[PDB]
């Protein structure tokens, strides 16, 4: 129940064979460097690489389209060391559903814009900014509710899967464009 | 039984309700005026699928997952015809990508596709099968249409509400799919 933070976001994962829903804290830190590279903690190289490729394109896109403010620092990601850590690893098969969160955290750190902490999110993204479908949306929604999040963001593509429930604000999104105003503190 | 360039996708419309089986047909012909002709498939999905098919067709053959094509395998030098029995919603459209890609590869390499399954799922350039929405509604549609089996993204197995009368086959990659859907015999 805190105030916005830069580079910190809450994802939603389904763990173990039983597919148990749980919240996962994601923290991304970025620093200019002559020895560029990534340092991953509890996030596979594949998920990380893809998330970076996406954040690289989408960060430039939304800024150029004036949907996100110009960063104070250099928006290029190839000239820095990126630190990504997950409080716990996602399962191999559910891992891609953390991409939206990782991208938002990278974008948040890259543009030094505080990210709201009153929501959790699940979903992937494509180079166009479309929010992609994920699996286990109900288990993830329940986990968000358990930690007391006021809102949970999911792919519009998964609304059909949602088992009518209350106790939390379920917000479907179809594009990174719709997400921005929901997760960023532009004040 | 097997047909070249024909496959069955699964769509969900409106707020909810059982899905619809969507017959997808792809035809490819060499032409000095290459381009695409679309029917009930958006330009975005068609474009993405063609790019995916161009890359994955070459990848599968180069990785011995499909036989060496006897004909020209270039998509840039031909007219591609893709038609859906019905349009998908904008938000569910991506879930037809695997199917379209498979149908394109089928027509391009002239390898018939088995006609005893329905499929749902997207794909990335690496060949990973991506999650989709409304899997339960889609599996239902498949069953009611009479399909013996339905292929879905492994990422969605957790969403599957127990059901009977149909073989549910979760897959994580295009590689796993190929032997299950192509008629190589």
From Swiss-Prot, chain A:
Which residues are the active-site ones?
97, 140
The Lon proteolytic domain, residue ranges: 3-186
User: Which cell locations does it reside in?
Assistant: Cell membrane
Q: What does the UniProt function comment say about this protein?
A: ATP-dependent serine protease that mediates the selective degradation of mutant and abnormal proteins as well as certain short-lived regulatory proteins. Degrades polypeptides processively.
Q: Please report which protein family the annotation says this sequence is part of.
A: Belongs to the peptidase S16 family. Archaeal LonB subfamily.
Subunit details: Homohexamer. Organized in a ring with a central cavity.
What's the protein name? Archaeal Lon protease
Protein's organism: Methanocaldococcus jannaschii (strain ATCC 43067 / DSM 2661 / JAL-1 / JCM 10045 / NBRC 100440)
Entire protein: shown range = 456 to 640 of 649
From Swiss-Prot, chain B:
Which residue positions are annotated as catalytic? Answer: 95, 138
Indicate the quaternary assembly.
Answer: Homohexamer. Organized in a ring with a central cavity.
Q: Which residues form a coiled coil?
A: none
Stated family: Belongs to the peptidase S16 family. Archaeal LonB subfamily.
Instruction: Tell me the organism's taxonomic lineage.
Output: Archaea, Methanobacteriati, Methanobacteriota, Methanomada group, Methanococci
* Disulfide linkage: none
Q: Which residues form the Lon proteolytic domain?
A: 1-184
State what protein this is by name: Archaeal Lon protease
Signal sequence span is: none
Q: Which domain of life is it from?
A: Archaea
What role is this protein assigned? ATP-dependent serine protease that mediates the selective degradation of mutant and abnormal proteins as well as certain short-lived regulatory proteins. Degrades polypeptides processively.
Entry's localization field:
Cell membrane
């Amino acid at each position: 129940h805190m105030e916005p933070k830069v580079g910190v976001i809450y994802g939603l994962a389904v763990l173990g064979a039983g597919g148990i829903g749980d919240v996962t804290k994601i923290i991304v830190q970025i620093l200019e460097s002559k020895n560029p590279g990534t340092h991953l903690l509890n996030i596979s190289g594949d998920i990380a690489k893809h998330s970076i490729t996406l954040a690289s394109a989408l960060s430039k896109k939304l800024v150029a389209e004036k949907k996100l403010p110009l960063p104070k620092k250099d928006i290029d990601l190839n000239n820095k060391e990126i630190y990504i850590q997950f409080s716990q690893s996602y399962s191999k098969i559910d891992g891609d559903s953390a991409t939206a969160a990782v991208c938002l955290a990278i974008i948040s750190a890259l543009l030094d814009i505080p990210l709201k902490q009153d929501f959790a999110i699940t979903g992937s993204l494509d180079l166009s900014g479309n929010v992609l479908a994920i699996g286990g949306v109900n288990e993830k929604i329940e986990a968000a509710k358990r930690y007391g999040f006021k809102r949970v963001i999911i792919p519009e593509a998964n609304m059909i899967d949602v088992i009518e429930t209350e106790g939390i604000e379920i917000i479907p999104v179809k594009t990174l464009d719709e997400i921005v105003p929901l997760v960023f503190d532009l004040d």
